[PDB]
Amino acid sequence: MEPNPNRQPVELNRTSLYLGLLLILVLALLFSSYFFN
Amino acid sequence: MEVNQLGLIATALFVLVPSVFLIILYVQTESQQ
Amino acid sequence: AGGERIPLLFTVKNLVASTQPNVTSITTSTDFKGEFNVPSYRTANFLDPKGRGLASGYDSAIALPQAKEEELARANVKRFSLTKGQISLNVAKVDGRTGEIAGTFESEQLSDDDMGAHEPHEVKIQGVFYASIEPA
Amino acid sequence: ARRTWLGDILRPLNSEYGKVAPGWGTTPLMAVFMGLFLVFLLIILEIYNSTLILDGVNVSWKALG
Amino acid sequence: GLPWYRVHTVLINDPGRLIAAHLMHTALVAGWAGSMALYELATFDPSDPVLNPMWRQGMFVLPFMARLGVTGSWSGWSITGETGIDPGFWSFEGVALAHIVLSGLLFLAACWHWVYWDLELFRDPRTGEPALDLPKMFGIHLFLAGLLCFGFGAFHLTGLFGPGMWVSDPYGLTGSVQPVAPEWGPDGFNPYNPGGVVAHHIAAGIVGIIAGLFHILVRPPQRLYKALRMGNIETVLSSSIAAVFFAAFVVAGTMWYGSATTPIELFGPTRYQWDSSYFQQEINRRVQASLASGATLEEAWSAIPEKLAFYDYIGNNPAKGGLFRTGPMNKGDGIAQAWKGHAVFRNKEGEELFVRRMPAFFESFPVILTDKNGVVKADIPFRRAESKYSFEQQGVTVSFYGGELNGQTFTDPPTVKSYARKAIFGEIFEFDTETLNSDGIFRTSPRGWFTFAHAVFALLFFFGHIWHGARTLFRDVFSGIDPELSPEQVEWGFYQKVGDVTTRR
Amino acid sequence: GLPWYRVHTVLINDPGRLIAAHLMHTALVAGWAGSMALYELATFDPSDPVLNPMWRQGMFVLPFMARLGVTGSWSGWSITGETGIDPGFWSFEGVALAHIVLSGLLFLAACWHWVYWDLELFRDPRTGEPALDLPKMFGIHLFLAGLLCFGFGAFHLTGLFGPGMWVSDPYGLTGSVQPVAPEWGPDGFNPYNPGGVVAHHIAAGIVGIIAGLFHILVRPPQRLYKALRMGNIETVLSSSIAAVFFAAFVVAGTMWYGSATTPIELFGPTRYQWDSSYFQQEINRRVQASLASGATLEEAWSAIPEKLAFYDYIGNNPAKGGLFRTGPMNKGDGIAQAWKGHAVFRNKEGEELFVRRMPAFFESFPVILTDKNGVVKADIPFRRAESKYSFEQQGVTVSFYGGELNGQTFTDPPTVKSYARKAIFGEIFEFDTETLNSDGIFRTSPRGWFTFAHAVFALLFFFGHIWHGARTLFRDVFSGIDPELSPEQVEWGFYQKVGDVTTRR
Amino acid sequence: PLGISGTFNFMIVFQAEHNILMHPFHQLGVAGVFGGALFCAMHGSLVTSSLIRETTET
Amino acid sequence: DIDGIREPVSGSLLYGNNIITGAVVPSSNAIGLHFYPIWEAASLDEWLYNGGPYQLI
Numbered sequence A: 001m002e003p004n005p006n007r008q009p010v011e012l013n014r015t016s017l018y019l020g021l022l023l024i025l026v027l028a029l030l031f032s033s034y035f036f037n
Numbered sequence B: 001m002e003v004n005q006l007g008l009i010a011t012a013l014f015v016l017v018p019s020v021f022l023i024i025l026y027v028q029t030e031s032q033q
Numbered sequence C: 001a002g003g004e005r006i007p008l009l010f011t012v013k014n015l016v017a018s019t020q021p022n023v024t025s026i027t028t029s030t031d032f033k034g035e036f037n038v039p040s041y042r043t044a045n046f047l048d049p050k051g052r053g054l055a056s057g058y059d060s061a062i063a064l065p066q067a068k069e070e071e072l073a074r075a076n077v078k079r080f081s082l083t084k085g086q087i088s089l090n091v092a093k094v095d096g097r098t099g100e101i102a103g104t105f106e107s108e109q110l111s112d113d114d115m116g117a118h119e120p121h122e123v124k125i126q127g128v129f130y131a132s133i134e135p136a
Numbered sequence D: 001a002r003r004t005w006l007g008d009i010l011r012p013l014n015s016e017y018g019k020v021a022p023g024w025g026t027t028p029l030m031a032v033f034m035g036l037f038l039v040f041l042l043i044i045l046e047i048y049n050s051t052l053i054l055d056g057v058n059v060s061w062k063a064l065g
Numbered sequence E, F: 001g002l003p004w005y006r007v008h009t010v011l012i013n014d015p016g017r018l019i020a021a022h023l024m025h026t027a028l029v030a031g032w033a034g035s036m037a038l039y040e041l042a043t044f045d046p047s048d049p050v051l052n053p054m055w056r057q058g059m060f061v062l063p064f065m066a067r068l069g070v071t072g073s074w075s076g077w078s079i080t081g082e083t084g085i086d087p088g089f090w091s092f093e094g095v096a097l098a099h100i101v102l103s104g105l106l107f108l109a110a111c112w113h114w115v116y117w118d119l120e121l122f123r124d125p126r127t128g129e130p131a132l133d134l135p136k137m138f139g140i141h142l143f144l145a146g147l148l149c150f151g152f153g154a155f156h157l158t159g160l161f162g163p164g165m166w167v168s169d170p171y172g173l174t175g176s177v178q179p180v181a182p183e184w185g186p187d188g189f190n191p192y193n194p195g196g197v198v199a200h201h202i203a204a205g206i207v208g209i210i211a212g213l214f215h216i217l218v219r220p221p222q223r224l225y226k227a228l229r230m231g232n233i234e235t236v237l238s239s240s241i242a243a244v245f246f247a248a249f250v251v252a253g254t255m256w257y258g259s260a261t262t263p264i265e266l267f268g269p270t271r272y273q274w275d276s277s278y279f280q281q282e283i284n285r286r287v288q289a290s291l292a293s294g295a296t297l298e299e300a301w302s303a304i305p306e307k308l309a310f311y312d313y314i315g316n317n318p319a320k321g322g323l324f325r326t327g328p329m330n331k332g333d334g335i336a337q338a339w340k341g342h343a344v345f346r347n348k349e350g351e352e353l354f355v356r357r358m359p360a361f362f363e364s365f366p367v368i369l370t371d372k373n374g375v376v377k378a379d380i381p382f383r384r385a386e387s388k389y390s391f392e393q394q395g396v397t398v399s400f401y402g403g404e405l406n407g408q409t410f411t412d413p414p415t416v417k418s419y420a421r422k423a424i425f426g427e428i429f430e431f432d433t434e435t436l437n438s439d440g441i442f443r444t445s446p447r448g449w450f451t452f453a454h455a456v457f458a459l460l461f462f463f464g465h466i467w468h469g470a471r472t473l474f475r476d477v478f479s480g481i482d483p484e485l486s487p488e489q490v491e492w493g494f495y496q497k498v499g500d501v502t503t504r505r
Numbered sequence G: 001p002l003g004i005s006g007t008f009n010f011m012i013v014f015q016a017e018h019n020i021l022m023h024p025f026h027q028l029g030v031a032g033v034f035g036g037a038l039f040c041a042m043h044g045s046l047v048t049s050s051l052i053r054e055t056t057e058t
Numbered sequence H: 001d002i003d004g005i006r007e008p009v010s011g012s013l014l015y016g017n018n019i020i021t022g023a024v025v026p027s028s029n030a031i032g033l034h035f036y037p038i039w040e041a042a043s044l045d046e047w048l049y050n051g052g053p054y055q056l057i
């Protein structure tokens, strides 16, 4: 049985890394006050 | 202050889990090219 | 239900049980009612899991050297209860030949209080009894 | 592809990919059932809303007796 | 490579790994169910279903097991308070265990389908390409849905072969699992009639069988096949999401308004029962009745079951919570211990006075005592200097009938005010705040939490519907519009009919 | 590629990025010291240098600032108890700020050297290869180390231009920062003579300056250059680790045993002061003197300072802790509030009895009272059935002198028994257990934690020395032995000298 | 017992009732496992030490 | 003391504020529109109580 032809590489460029890390850290900054309550 | 004690673990995982996810994806992108 | 285990010293120690007055014979309507002592479920040498006891053992919580003792006094100070129970014996079968009787019983007593550590429960016990009477 | 016993049994159930009835087919009949179902949801909604009030239908907890 | 937000599209043309993924999802959801129940069993206190029911304890899945007949524990308790029962294997624990075993079995099947993805069943016999005859699959699955739906109603809910479901009186005092017979009349559409739930599943089950049979034998019209791209699995995702968010809005509403399937002994009262004084009406009804037949005040109120009094108290109103006030309601006002009794206030002239009750909108509310006509006769003033109506000036006293303070009267103004500040919440209870280290602030119930999550998820799945619907109908331009789109096609007047090149002028 | 445990070897032939790596490590460390100090200020209670000194509060870096002359905060308190004091910039807060700023400048330096790694300075003019002249660098760095060592002793420690260092009396009552003269005599080598610390730095600094000069001017002989592989930077790593773990064992030693650099007012008592009853002896001397001058028992014991009694208590013995008993000592026995007084026990015959003290080995210890001869006279028995020495049988009383209980006598056996159980710990103190929610179990002091960490670290660094020492001397075969190694070199009898082919037959 | 602390309990009670430490079969067991650990490290170290160069340093 | 009424408002994290509630608090009403640099205060202690940093920032 052949290997699966539907597989694909996945990518995240550096700029998307910086964008996503900013998103997560600012979201944590906003909700943390509410988690500690 | 008398804050909810699980707030710390909530906040730590809230940061760590999705950040690690992004870092995993970025580094394996770089070792491709 | 829920998983709570209730130990008890099921006992008739020092039983004194009496019939109604003017009993010319024991019949299948004869009732005895009496009371017994219920000593502590553990006796004085029993050591608890941290080595504390009444007649032996540590007299304090040695694992917490500088804790305030006042919070622990009820656990540190073992106490020996003695309480009373009540029992009914209802004769429902008599072999007037042999002097054998048989019937049911109900008793009420208290359960283990763990040498004063917690409050006992009320227990009601039911069952059957047999006795043989001999001229003394 | 790999054949299996269960595969061969189920086979005809996944064998008519693409088959259509011609033209509009049962579309008019579907439209009727859609219409009936709209009216029926309307009633159900307006009963819950107390905009449709019906005899012996008391929309309150007191309909548990 | 693929962007991160598209990793799962590798399954679009791979029915076997699509099944593998769906199995893993189903494994995870069932696993959750089993984990959630175990955590709840380990934290649930079954010892008082009157003043510490499951819905005060932050219980979420326990009420859904109870709703359909699972009411006891292997440990010997039942949620109805009966003790020494033997549930058999279908205890809370056994239900939890089955979902975990099911989870493990789904996990293994997922592995098998992921490795052996290339099954001939998934190939179109004419072209050798993977293909799923989605119209016929719909008919098969719909036929199955209808069998299950019908059986659920015909056997489980009736008690014919099954336990029935939770039913209760209108005041949630005596609920239990009973078989329910169908209501075939128009009151079967009454959301508060449990017989309608039975009839629905029977009739709808039969319609589903018939519709299923139709959709297995009758092919889709070509017009419709073309319109809805019935060769594209994503059209099914688009319509499926739409049905899912429809269902989600419905279950949120019936949870919030109440219906036969959201009984208050499993989920708590609704806010509307506070708005309309639903339990307070009933309580007064009984005191009047006790009085008419000559009982004393102490007697009339002592006859009031605590369970009913506890519903007439705003701390159980699901609209008194907050988003980040977490945990069980007990964590806020405490673990209710006893009804203190019904507080009656009187001024120095013997007139009875009535505390104005807090409306759900208000975090805080002033203490205002009115007479039976609604005229203000006492309050607790803010500015003291021009106070007309103070408890001190008006001689207000509080007397208790029934409950733990029955037959007690208080006259010292600070004590009387203290009870008047609680009377705005409805009936007055004694709470244990030490055990949970309760902070004193009202939390919402499971009815509230469930409604919030499901209303929110619904709205979000509407966006999913719009996104995947768009993707289906505009598949051809996903990656961009035609680089040879000619300007005559988008400029006005060239074609009579917009976009149709055969209508040139 | 590279194994995970070798990633950092990319720096071996890259002096610029090595410097960058080292700058970054340096920034991390200064950053830590500033962070650590701020956390300790945010949590330090300065209000009681007697019964709540720093070493009771888990302060770790606070004493190293105190040790060298930083003693005050910008908020106007000092650790010597003096209020209303202007420390200038070099307060605890200013020192922390400085390390944070320094950390940030080193961070930027590291980015610069990382980016501009290819500097011509790091390349050998002869061959154009990256080269570091390590003999010359050593001389340079030794000379600088000597200058700093000398100046630190000549100016900071003497007070010529600088504050001096923590000095105290032999019982840790009156410590403070004072200039210290050098002790040039043989007592300079006495670890308890502070003047030796000064003299050490002056002379050692001078020696370093000369040695550094020799090492800048005189090339190493070919013999040693080959034997020690001085063209290979890993040789420096190997010898450096060795000097490091050597140094780490010494500071662990001097911290455990005590020295002029590890004062008890900053780090707590040593265990050996408990073992020899060092403080108990002195307290007794003072008492025996007062009674000589004709004061009463109350008067003689009331003259003992709280500070001195607090040292005669096993809760401050650093050898009484546990590895996972975490936090400050106040978290164990609580926050010391007052001396209760010296407890004197007597039997019914009026003879005075002495509680035998707990040795540090013992987690728990029986209560045994002996007379002045050490004959057992009273105890708390385990088995009571055949006790002869119970307090009830012997009429044991307790009377207090000094402290909060001065002049009180307790006669009921339960009370006498609780004070006898505390008398095994030494002097009895009133503690606050509520504030920190203390659990009653002894912790160790910063003296113990410092000693543990450095002795562990020293031992591991030994393995680092062996590792990099072997990699230096065996670099040629680090990847494996020579694939064409003849048996004649490794088998017996061929060569007259092992591993020398010239000695064949 | 099937536990970590229960194992130690079993070990301690054993020593008290049998002086297992003074029993030569246990002494042979300690030689067995000490020596087995020794020869384990010895063999590993000796083979590792004489690996033929087949790779580079990276 | 933002409002000059000797009623200090706590604004910083270490004095019991979180991210949402924290603030650098405006300078005292007793100062009005007067310039209040550091060197116009008897001490940093005074400057801090009266809202000095708001003006600087």
Ligand code: CLA
Residues within 6 Å of the ligand: D041, D044, D045, D046, D048, E183, E184, E188, E189, E190, E191, E196, E197, E199, E200, E201, E203, E204, E207, E208, E245, E246, E249, E250, E254, E259
């Ligand atoms: C004798 C036959 C019989 C009987 C007695 C019933 C009885 C019942 N049916 Mg069933 N039914 C039957 C046959 C029968 N059915 C058949 C043959 C079918 C066809 C297969 C169905 C299909 C069916 C459906 C699809 C539904 C019912 C529902 C119900 C219940 C109505 C009460 C209720 O709470 O509605 C409450 C529900 C409504 C009032 C519908 C509201 C519709 C919303 C408002 C539409 C708009 C949503 C929109 C996307 C949101 C927009 C934004 C919004 C936030 C503002 C009741 C148990 C309803 C139900 O399950 O309720 C839980 C329901 O939704 N029935």
Ligand code: CLA
Residues within 6 Å of the ligand: A027, A031, E039, E040, E043, E057, E058, E059, E060, E323, E324, E325, E326, E327, E328, E445, E446, E449, E450, E453, E454
């Ligand atoms: C439908 C889902 C659902 C519902 C309604 C409940 C409801 C409840 N649970 Mg349950 N639970 C669930 C799922 C659910 N649970 C799941 C999936 C888990 C596993 C994690 C649990 C685990 C669990 C435990 C362990 C406990 C509960 C408990 C409770 C009770 C209190 C809940 C609470 O305080 O929430 C408060 C909730 C919040 C404050 C959540 C807010 C959501 C955040 C802010 C959203 C983040 C925003 C996001 C980043 C958006 C930005 C995106 C944008 C940038 C693009 C209540 C009955 C508790 C209880 O009382 O049990 C006895 C309890 O201890 N639950």
Ligand code: CLA
Residues within 6 Å of the ligand: E004, E005, E006, E007, E008, E009, E237, E241, E460, E461, E462, E463, E464, E465, E467, E468, E471
């Ligand atoms: C049954 C529901 C369902 C299913 C099967 C899919 C399936 C798909 N979506 Mg759709 N979608 C849905 C609901 C659904 N969606 C809903 C409700 C929304 C609105 C929120 C969307 C919005 C949406 C967008 C905007 C896009 C898709 C895309 C896709 C495709 C790629 C997804 C992917 O790789 O994600 C990868 C995602 C991750 C790796 C991580 C996401 C993590 C999120 C932020 C939080 C985690 C949630 C948590 C783990 C568990 C869920 C909790 C609760 C829902 C139960 C795939 C066919 C993509 C597409 O079209 O590509 C062609 C795309 O761009 N979806």
Ligand code: CLA
Residues within 6 Å of the ligand: F183, F184, F188, F189, F190, F191, F196, F197, F199, F200, F201, F203, F204, F207, F208, F245, F246, F249, F250, F254, F259
């Ligand atoms: C008049 C001049 C003068 C004076 C008064 C001093 C005074 C002092 N010197 Mg300095 N010294 C001087 C000149 C002077 N020095 C000069 C000119 C040099 C040459 C540059 C040095 C080099 C020097 C060194 C290298 C050391 C001192 C140390 C000391 C202190 C000794 C007291 C002590 O605590 O030792 C305690 C130290 C020891 C007793 C030596 C430890 C030896 C151990 C046993 C080595 C073996 C450890 C081994 C690796 C592992 C252990 C195995 C196992 C137990 C774990 C004291 C402050 C010592 C010090 O600073 O200690 C704090 C020290 O280590 N001196």
Ligand code: CLA
Residues within 6 Å of the ligand: F026, F027, F029, F030, F032, F033, F034, F036, F037, F061, F062, F064, F065, F068, F070, F095, F099, F142, F145, F146, F149, F204, F205, F207, F208, F209, F247
């Ligand atoms: C720039 C100057 C400077 C100054 C004045 C200070 C000052 C201080 N630091 Mg900071 N520090 C600095 C740079 C500086 N630091 C840098 C660059 C770093 C990062 C590496 C740190 C990291 C740091 C930490 C991690 C800590 C301090 C601490 C302290 C305080 C106590 C210092 C102490 O006990 O040293 C004691 C130092 C020694 C005992 C070193 C002795 C040298 C040994 C013996 C090596 C000898 C080998 C030598 C080559 C051979 C010489 C031969 C001889 C013949 C000449 C003090 C306020 C402590 C504190 O309280 O912080 C809050 C603390 O814990 N500092």
Ligand code: CLA
Residues within 6 Å of the ligand: F135, F138, F207, F208, F210, F211, F214, F215, F218, F219, F220, F221, F224, F228
């Ligand atoms: C911190 C002080 C220090 C250090 C690190 C060095 C380092 C060095 N010296 Mg310099 N030197 C110094 C001070 C120092 N020197 C001083 C004060 C003088 C007097 C002016 C000199 C005079 C001098 C000369 C004259 C020469 C050097 C040389 C050298 C180099 C080679 C050393 C060698 O072959 O060691 C060999 C030693 C070893 C390989 C390892 C020894 C390990 C010991 C023995 C272990 C002991 C363990 C034991 C258990 C612990 C003790 C127990 C306790 C009871 C005592 C090296 C760079 C040589 C060189 O190349 O010059 C350029 C050289 O020719 N030095």
Ligand code: CLA
Residues within 6 Å of the ligand: F040, F043, F057, F058, F059, F060, F323, F324, F325, F326, F327, F328, F445, F446, F449, F450, F451, F453, F454
């Ligand atoms: C030289 C190192 C050192 C030392 C001696 C101290 C000492 C102290 N600290 Mg400081 N601390 C340090 C470094 C150090 N700290 C660092 C680097 C940080 C930053 C994280 C801190 C942060 C810090 C805080 C935040 C606090 C302290 C506090 C304290 C005090 C109590 C510590 C305690 O309860 O320990 C508990 C220690 C342990 C439980 C030891 C854990 C070791 C385990 C066994 C891990 C190792 C296992 C390993 C994975 C095995 C794998 C092997 C593998 C190869 C097979 C004490 C005076 C406390 C205090 O009182 O503050 C005022 C406090 O609150 N410290």
Ligand code: CLA
Residues within 6 Å of the ligand: F004, F005, F006, F007, F008, F009, F237, F241, F460, F461, F463, F464, F465, F467, F468, F471
């Ligand atoms: C001054 C100290 C020092 C320095 C500069 C080095 C430098 C180096 N070591 Mg040596 N080493 C040291 C101390 C040191 N070591 C000590 C003390 C030990 C004994 C434990 C060793 C044992 C050792 C071995 C066994 C090996 C090296 C190797 C190496 C090289 C590669 C390191 C690497 O890629 O790690 C990469 C490491 C990681 C990605 C993560 C490691 C995580 C560790 C286990 C825990 C993290 C600790 C944490 C950050 C806090 C540190 C606290 C600190 C105070 C101790 C590099 C030249 C390797 C080599 O020879 O390459 C050819 C190798 O095989 N080292």
Ligand SMILES: CC1=C(/C=C/C(C)=C/C=C/C(C)=C/C=C/C=C(C)/C=C/C=C(C)/C=C/C2=C(C)CCCC2(C)C)C(C)(C)CCC1
Residues within 6 Å of the ligand: E028, E029, E030, E031, E032, E035, E100, E101, E102, E103, E104, E105, E107, E108
């Ligand atoms: C294999 C096997 C087995 C086993 C199994 C198991 C053991 C299972 C488990 C399972 C489980 C145990 C599972 C669980 C799961 C869980 C989950 C899946 C969860 C989820 C979650 C989430 C998703 C969440 C989310 C969130 C958050 C976090 C926040 C808030 C909001 C929300 C809700 C969104 C058996 C033996 C049976 C059999 C054989 C085989």
Ligand SMILES: CC1=C(/C=C/C(C)=C/C=C/C(C)=C/C=C/C=C(C)/C=C/C=C(C)/C=C/C2=C(C)CCCC2(C)C)C(C)(C)CCC1
Residues within 6 Å of the ligand: F028, F029, F030, F031, F032, F035, F100, F101, F102, F103, F104, F105, F107
């Ligand atoms: C840039 C800049 C700046 C800034 C800076 C900063 C802000 C920094 C900071 C920094 C810091 C803030 C740092 C920190 C660090 C820390 C550390 C480095 C830590 C460490 C840790 C560790 C390593 C640990 C370990 C361990 C554990 C965890 C457990 C137990 C055991 C042990 C101890 C081992 C400034 C403005 C100034 C200037 C300009 C520029």
Ligand SMILES: CCCCCCCCCCCCCCCCCC(=O)O
Residues within 6 Å of the ligand: F087, F088, F089, F090, F148
């Ligand atoms: C600010 C009020 C007090 C006066 C400050 C005195 C002047 C600054 C002293 C700073 C002490 C650091 C000197 C030791 C640093 C050694 C030199 C170095 O290695 O970089």
